[PDB]
Amino acid sequence: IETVPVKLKPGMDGPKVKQWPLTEEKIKALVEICTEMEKEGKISKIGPENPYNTPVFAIKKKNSTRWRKLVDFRELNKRTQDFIPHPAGLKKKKSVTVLDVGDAYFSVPLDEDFRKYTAFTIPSINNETPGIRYQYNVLPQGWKGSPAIFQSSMTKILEPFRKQNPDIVIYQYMDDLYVGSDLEIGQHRTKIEELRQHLLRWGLGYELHPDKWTVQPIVLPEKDSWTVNDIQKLVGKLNWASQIYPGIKVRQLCKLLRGTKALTEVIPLTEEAELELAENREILKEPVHGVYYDPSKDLIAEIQKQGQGQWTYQIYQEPFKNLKTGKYARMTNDVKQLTEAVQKITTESIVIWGKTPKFKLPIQKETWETWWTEYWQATWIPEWEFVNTPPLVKLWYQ
Amino acid sequence: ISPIETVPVKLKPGMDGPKVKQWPLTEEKIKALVEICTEMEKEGKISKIGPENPYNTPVFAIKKKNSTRWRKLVDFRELNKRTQDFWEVQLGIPHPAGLKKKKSVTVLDVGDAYFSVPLDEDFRKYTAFTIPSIPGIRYQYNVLPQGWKGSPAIFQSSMTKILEPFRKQNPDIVIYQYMDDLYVGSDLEIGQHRTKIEELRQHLLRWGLFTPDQKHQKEPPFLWMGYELHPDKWTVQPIVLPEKDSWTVNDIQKLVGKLNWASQIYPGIKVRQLCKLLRGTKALTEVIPLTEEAELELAENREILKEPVHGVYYDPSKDLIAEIQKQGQGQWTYQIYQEPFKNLKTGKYARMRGAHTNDVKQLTEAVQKITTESIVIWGKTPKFKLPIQKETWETWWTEYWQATWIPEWEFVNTPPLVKLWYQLEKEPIVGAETFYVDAGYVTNRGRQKVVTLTDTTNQKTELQAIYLALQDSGLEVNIVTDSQYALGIIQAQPDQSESELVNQIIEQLIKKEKVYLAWVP
Numbered sequence: 001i002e003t004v005p006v007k008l009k010p011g012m013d014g015p016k017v018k019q020w021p022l023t024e025e026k027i028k029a030l031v032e033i034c035t036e037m038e039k040e041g042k043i044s045k046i047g048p049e050n051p052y053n054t055p056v057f058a059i060k061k062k063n064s065t066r067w068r069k070l071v072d073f074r075e076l077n078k079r080t081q082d083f084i085p086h087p088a089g090l091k092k093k094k095s096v097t098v099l100d101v102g103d104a105y106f107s108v109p110l111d112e113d114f115r116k117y118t119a120f121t122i123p124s125i126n127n128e129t130p131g132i133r134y135q136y137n138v139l140p141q142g143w144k145g146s147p148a149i150f151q152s153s154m155t156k157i158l159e160p161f162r163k164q165n166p167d168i169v170i171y172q173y174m175d176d177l178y179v180g181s182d183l184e185i186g187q188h189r190t191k192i193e194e195l196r197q198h199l200l201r202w203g204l205g206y207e208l209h210p211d212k213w214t215v216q217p218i219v220l221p222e223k224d225s226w227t228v229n230d231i232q233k234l235v236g237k238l239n240w241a242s243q244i245y246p247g248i249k250v251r252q253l254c255k256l257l258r259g260t261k262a263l264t265e266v267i268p269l270t271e272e273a274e275l276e277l278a279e280n281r282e283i284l285k286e287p288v289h290g291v292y293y294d295p296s297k298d299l300i301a302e303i304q305k306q307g308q309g310q311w312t313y314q315i316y317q318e319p320f321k322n323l324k325t326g327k328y329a330r331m332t333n334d335v336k337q338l339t340e341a342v343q344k345i346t347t348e349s350i351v352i353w354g355k356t357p358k359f360k361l362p363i364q365k366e367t368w369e370t371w372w373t374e375y376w377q378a379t380w381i382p383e384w385e386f387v388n389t390p391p392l393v394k395l396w397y398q
Numbered sequence: 399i400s401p402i403e404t405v406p407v408k409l410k411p412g413m414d415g416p417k418v419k420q421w422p423l424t425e426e427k428i429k430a431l432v433e434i435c436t437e438m439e440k441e442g443k444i445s446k447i448g449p450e451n452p453y454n455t456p457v458f459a460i461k462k463k464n465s466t467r468w469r470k471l472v473d474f475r476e477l478n479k480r481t482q483d484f485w486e487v488q489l490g491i492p493h494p495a496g497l498k499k500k501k502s503v504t505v506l507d508v509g510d511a512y513f514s515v516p517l518d519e520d521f522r523k524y525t526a527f528t529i530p531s532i533p534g535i536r537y538q539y540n541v542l543p544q545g546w547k548g549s550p551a552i553f554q555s556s557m558t559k560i561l562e563p564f565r566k567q568n569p570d571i572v573i574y575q576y577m578d579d580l581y582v583g584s585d586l587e588i589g590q591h592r593t594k595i596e597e598l599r600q601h602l603l604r605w606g607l608f609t610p611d612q613k614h615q616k617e618p619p620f621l622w623m624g625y626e627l628h629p630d631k632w633t634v635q636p637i638v639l640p641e642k643d644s645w646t647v648n649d650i651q652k653l654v655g656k657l658n659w660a661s662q663i664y665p666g667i668k669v670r671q672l673c674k675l676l677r678g679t680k681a682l683t684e685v686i687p688l689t690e691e692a693e694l695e696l697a698e699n700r701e702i703l704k705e706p707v708h709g710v711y712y713d714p715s716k717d718l719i720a721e722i723q724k725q726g727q728g729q730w731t732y733q734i735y736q737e738p739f740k741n742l743k744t745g746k747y748a749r750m751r752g753a754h755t756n757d758v759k760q761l762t763e764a765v766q767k768i769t770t771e772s773i774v775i776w777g778k779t780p781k782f783k784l785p786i787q788k789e790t791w792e793t794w795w796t797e798y799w800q801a802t803w804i805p806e807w808e809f810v811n812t813p814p815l816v817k818l819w820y821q822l823e824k825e826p827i828v829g830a831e832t833f834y835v836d837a838g839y840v841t842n843r844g845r846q847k848v849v850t851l852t853d854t855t856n857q858k859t860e861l862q863a864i865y866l867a868l869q870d871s872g873l874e875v876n877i878v879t880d881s882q883y884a885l886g887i888i889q890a891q892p893d894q895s896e897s898e899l900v901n902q903i904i905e906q907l908i909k910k911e912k913v914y915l916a917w918v919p
C-alpha cells in the first residue's frame with residue numbers, strides 16, 4: 001500500500017547491537033518462526049552490505065506451548081524520530097486486561113529506506129555458521145514507530161467498540177492493549193472475548209486490578225520491651241526517613257541511648273520518648289506530600305531482595321521523592337522472581353504514567369542476561385542497569 | 399568471474415572515491431605489472447577504463463616470499479577508508495569441543511576463489527589503478543579486490559549462497575566455512591566421502607570457484623588455530639617447554655601464556671609461581687631466577703605436557719556434565735565431559751570479582767562462567783556437579799542481597815568442599831561484651847583501648863577498630879560501629895580478601911563462637 005516515510009533522529013545512525021548467545025532450543029524456535037515470516041513476505045534475508053544489528057530472543061507464551069519472537073528494538077527506538085496521551089482513569093479501573101495486538105503491524109509495510117535498520121540476526125552455535133540475517137519489510141513488533149504509524153488504522157478499528165461501549169477504557173502501549181472497565185469479572189471477561197472477535201473482524205491473557213494497588217509506607221517496629229539494640233535500629237531507621245519526612249525527631253530516643261550500655265539491655269522509654277516515637281509513626285503513616293509526577297523526567301525503579309522470595313521496589317524520579325513503593329512475593333528462584341517483579345512494575349508504570357521505568361537490578365549482568373529470557377513473557381523490554389544494593393537500604397524496607 | 403548475484407557496495411556518506419596519485423615505479427616493475435594486468439584482463443578480472451574515471455589507487459610490484467618472480471599489489475587503504483562498513487560479523491573462534499565426531503573430514507584451500515567472486519558494477523569504477531608508461535593503461539576491478547574491505551564479508555555470504563543448495567540435498571555432509579579454508583566432514587564411508595567431496599568440489603566449479611585436486615590436498619590431523627584436529631579427537635599442538643638456565647621477563651610471560659593455552663584441556667596446569675616471578679619487573683629483558691616453588695611448578699607442568707592428552711568431540715546424544723573443584727584459594731578447576739571422566743574441554747577460573755569474597759560466591763561465579771561457556775560452544779547448559787552442600791548454598795543464597803541462580807546441579811563429595819567458615823548472629827548476644835568502636839573502642843564493661851595509626855586511610859581506620867574489638871574480646875562479642883563500609887564488608891561474610899587487615903579480621907571471625915555486628919550513625 002503506502003509506506004509512510006520514517007527517519008532516525010538528526011545525525012544518528014542505525015543500531016549495531018551485539019547478539020547475546022542463545023540456547024539451541026531458542027534458536028530452533030527463531031528459525032521456525034522467522035522462516036514462516038519470510039514466506040509470508042514479512043521479513044527478508046539480508047546481505048553483508050547491512051552492517052546494522054538488533055538482538056532477537058525467543059520467549060514462551062503464557063500457558064501455551066508456543067514461542068513468541070522478541071526483538072530488542074530498544075536502541076533503535078531510542079534512535080528513531082519522534083511522533084493517545086494517557087487515560088488517568090485507567091489506574092482507577094477495577095479490572096484491566098492486556099492483549100497482544102502486535103500482529104496487526106504485519107499488515108502495514110515499513111518505509112523501504114528505513115528497513116535496513118531493523119536488521120537482526122539468529123545466532124549460530126559456537127560461531128560455526130555465519131548466522132541468519134533478516135530485516136523487516138512490514139512494521140516490526142516492538143519498534144516505537146509501529147504503534148504511531150498504525151495509530152490511524154487502529155483508531156478506526158476502535159470506535160465501533162469505544163462508542164458502543166463507552167464504559168470500556170482501551171489504552172495502547174507498543175504491542176499491548178490495556179482494556180479496563182468496572183464490569184464484574186463475569187461480564188468483564190465476556191466484553192474482552194467480544195473485543196477479540198471484533199478485532200478478528202478486521203484481521204488482527206494478562207488481567208490486572210489497578211484499583212487494588214496500594215503504596216507500601218515506611219514502617220517502624222512495634223514491640224513489647226525495647227533493648228539498646230532495638231532503639232539503635234529505631235533511631236538509625238528514623239534518621240534515614242527524616243530526610244523524606246523532616247518532621248521526624250530522634251532527640252528523646254538518642255537520650256535513651258546515652259552511655260555505652262550493653263546491647264541487650266532493656267531500656268524503658270521515657271514518656272517524651274514514647275510520644276516522639278508515636279509522632280514519628282504518624283508522620284510515616286502517609287507518603288510525603290508534594291510528590292508530583294513529571295512527564296519530562298525518567299521514571300526510575302529500584303528493587304531490593306528481602307529474602308525468602310520477598311522483594312521491595314520504589315518508583316521515583318527524584319531521589320527519595322518516590323511516586324510509588326510496593327512489595328512482591330513469589331508466585332521459583334531469585335532470577336525468576338526478579339523477572340516477574342520487573343515485569344509487574346513495568347506493567348504498573350504503564351497503566352499509571354503510561355511509561356516504562358528504568359530499572360536498577362540487584363544481580364550480576366551475566367546472570368541476568370542468561371536467565372531473564374527464561375522467565376520473560378512481556379512484549380516490551382524495559383531499560384535496566386545492574387547495581388550493588390547497600391545493606392542499609394534493605395534494612396529500611398518492610 | 400562467477401554467475402553470482404553481485405553484492406551492492408556503496409561509499410560512506412558524502413565521500414568521494416580515492417583520488418590517490420600513483421607513486422612512480424621502476425621500468426622493470428612497470429613491465430612486470432603490465433604482464434600480470436593483461437593476464438587478468440584476458441580472464442575478465444579487470445578491464446581497461448577511459449579518462450572518464452578520475453579515481454586512482456596505488457599499485458606496486460613485489461616478489462613472492464622465497465621465489466624470483468613478480469607479484470602485483472594494490473594499496474586499497476584509502477579506498478578502504480572511504481568504503482562503507484560491512485557486517486563483518488563477530489571475531490569469535492569456534493572451540494573444537496563443539497565439533498562432532500566425523501568418520502571423514504577434508505579441507506579445501508579456497509584462496510584465490512576470492513577473485514572469482516564479482517564486484518558491484520557501479521562500484522568497480524572506484525577500484526581504479528594505473529600502470530604508467532615507461533599511451534597509459536588505466537584499469538578497474540571486475541571482481542573482489544584482494545585486500546579490500548568488503549571482500550571477506552561479501553565473499554563469505556556469496557560462498558554461503560553457493561553452498562546452501564548443496565548443503566540442502568546433502569544433509570549427511572557438514573561444510574563449515576572459515577577464511578580461505580573450507581572444512582568438510584561427514585560420517586560417510588571413505589569411498590563415498592571422496593565422491594561427495596568431488597561433487598562439492600565441482601559444485602563450486604559450476605559457480606566458478608577454483609578448488610584444489612584431492613591429490614594435492616592437506617591430510618589430517620589439521621593444525622587449526624593452536625589446536626590439532628583429528629576427525630575423532632583433538633588437542634593443542636605440540637607445546638614444548640624450554641629448558642633454559644636464565645629466564646627473561648618476556649620469557650616468563652610467553653611461558654605463562656603457553657601454559658594457559660594448555661589449561662583448556664590439560665588439567666592441573668598451574669602458573670601461580672611463574673606469575674609471581676613478574677613482581678617488580680623493571681624490564682622485558684630482565685632475568686629472574688626461578689624460586690624452588692617455580693622450579694617445581696615448571697617441572698610438574700612439564701611432566702603433564704609429556705603425555706599427549708586428547709579432548710573428545712561433542713555428541714548431541716549425550717548430556718553435558720560440568721564438574722568444578724577448588725584447586726587453591728581463588729583457583730577453581732573445571733572440566734566438562736559427556737562420557738564418564740572423558741572431557742571435551744577443561745579449564746580454570748580465578749576471576750576475583752571484588753576486593754573481598756567467599757568460596758560460595760566465587761563458586762557461583764565460576765558456575766556462571768561455565769554456563770555461559772557451554773551455551774556459546776554447545777548452545778545448552780551442562781548439569782553441574784559441585785563440591786558444596788545444598789544446605790550451605792541455600793544459607794548464603796537466601797541471606798545475600800543480590801539475586802542469583804545456579805542451573806541444575808548435584809553435590810559431589812570430593813574435598814575440599816566449599817563452606818562458610820563463620821556466620822554473624824542475627825540478633826545481639828546476651829552475656830557477650832559490647833564493643834563501641836570508632837582509633838579505639840569502649841565497652842559496656844568499662845574496657846577501653848585507643849591508639850594512633852601512621853599510614854591508615856579513613857576507611858582503613860574503621861576496620862582497624864573492629865579488628866581491635868575482635869582481638870581483645872572473648873568468644874562471643876557484640877560489636878557496634880558507625881562505618882557502613884566495614885559493616886557491609888563483614889556482612890558479606892568474606893573468607894578471602896586483598897587487604898591483609900580484612901583477612902586478619904576474617905581469621906578472628908572464624909575463631910569466634912558468636913559475633914554480632916551492629917550499625918549506628
Ligand SMILES: CCN1c2cc([N+](=O)[O-])ccc2N(C)C(=O)c2cccnc21
Pocket residue numbers: 127128129492497498499500503505572573574575576581582583620622627628629630
Ligand atoms: C568440517 C568441520 N570441521 C571443522 C569445523 C570448524 N568450524 O565449524 O568452525 C572448524 C574447524 C574444523 N576442522 C578444521 C576440522 O578438522 C573438524 C574436525 C572434526 C569435526 N569437524 C571439523
